[PDB]
Design a protein around this ligand. Sequence first.
Ligand SMILES: *[C@@H]1O[C@H](CO)[C@@H](O)[C@H](O)[C@H]1NC(C)=O
Ligand SMILES: *[C@@H]1O[C@H](CO)[C@@H](O)[C@H](O)[C@H]1NC(C)=O
Length: 353
Amino acid sequence: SDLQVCLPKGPTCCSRKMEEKYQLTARLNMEQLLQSASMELKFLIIQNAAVFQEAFEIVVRHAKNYTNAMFKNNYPSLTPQAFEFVGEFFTDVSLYILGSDINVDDMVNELFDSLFPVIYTQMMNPGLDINECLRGARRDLKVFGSFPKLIMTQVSKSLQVTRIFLQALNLGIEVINTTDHLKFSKDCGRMLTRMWYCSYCQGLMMVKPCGGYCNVVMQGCMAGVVEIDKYWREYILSLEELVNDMENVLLGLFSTIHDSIQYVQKNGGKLTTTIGKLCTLSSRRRELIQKLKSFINFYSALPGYICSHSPVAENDTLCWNGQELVERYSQEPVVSQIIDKLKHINQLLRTMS
Ligand SMILES: *[C@@H]1O[C@H](CO)[C@@H](O)[C@H](O)[C@H]1NC(C)=O
Ligand SMILES: *[C@@H]1O[C@H](CO)[C@@H](O)[C@H](O)[C@H]1NC(C)=O
């Protein structure tokens, strides 16, 4: 008589307060169903994100170790200072891989800025306050040739693809975790309450809602959610485009650095006088992608999941149509944030490869 959701066709066994209860369980039932649909995909990316993050850090640590080892072996006169700017470089390497605001060109530079004064003082002119004059002379006189720019492009290409690979996995975690927190319209909350519970208010014990009625209701409130599909697909294929490395580059840096130190030593005669006057991975991300491609239908199949895991009369016979038991059935802001972040990422993937 005073109900606001359950259309009272005949009498009704539930009051207004019982309509609250049914509306809140409708909310809770929807969130649980969405969360059950997204659990297995969420855990897949969470697993891989944790593994790949440690695997990359193992690579960076191994690359730092070997660069320090070739400094110990080939340039003992540059140690222990060598250990300081090598460690600072690879620390910034990791920090950049994990998404922090680090400038790759500033990394490579600062490395050669710190490396040149000790090369001059210990290898070229044996025999502290003039240090800043030497650091400026490194770049102003281009003592290292194209070696810094060579390393610059060599590592910026591989560190950018590794950084975006991690950023893409985490953002995938972020949007899939956002699905089961998706708040819906007030009209849908009433429709879901009608579809799932308002039959109990009419005194029915085993009646299930119609599969067709569930389809028009689900398509009702997932109209915005389903629009994410196109962008979620493009995210999957763009991620496949990137995987199809950074180890070989980072584990080759010593070689390039060592040759750069030979290069600056080749013109020492004129340089000293001028300055004196002046002063199994790839298998893992392949398996991840093949497992991620099984979830390309996630957003399109989502209304199908909610109806197929809720009790419905698929036959559309002897079912509940939201207001009565029939013989046959007749028949943005958060979502836009998901699409924006998907758009931003997809663009970022497509440009790398
Ligand atoms: C290798 O790296 C680990 C951790 O960075 C360090 O404890 C160890 O001393 C390194 N070994 C060599 C030979 O550089
Ligand atoms: C999922 O979302 C909830 C609430 O927004 C948040 O507390 C939680 O940390 C998120 N989990 C992940 C793995 O992002």
